Ligand binder design. Structure first.
Ligand SMILES: [Zn+2]
Ligand SMILES: [Zn+2]
Ligand SMILES: [Zn+2]
Length: 82
């Protein structure tokens, strides 16, 4: 796949229509904390309760990967893998 890292900052990517918004009960500060397809690392969340929402006109937002305020645990952004 293609990759564009956001090293040293937050992701903040606006979700595209049809795309999943990933949330994790264990890792997220709260239920508004979400991760995009570029960033969500399945390895961070193996035995966690992860849910996906789907981006629409009413359901939108920005990816919180790299926003320290959004996460209990250190995330390993999928984009950073090579
Ligand atoms: Zn992201
Ligand atoms: Zn990321
Ligand atoms: Zn998690």
């Amino acid at each position: 796949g293609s990759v564009h890292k956001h090293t040293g900052r937050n992701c903040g990517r606006k979700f595209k229509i049809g795309e999943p918004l990933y949330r994790c009960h264990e890792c997220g500060c709260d239920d508004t904390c979400v991760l995009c397809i570029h960033c969500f690392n399945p390895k961070d969340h193996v035995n966690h309760h992860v849910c996906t929402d789907i981006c629409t006109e009413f359901t939108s937002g920005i990816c919180d990967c790299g926003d320290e305020e959004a996460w209990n645990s250190p995330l390993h952004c999928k984009a950073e893998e090579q």
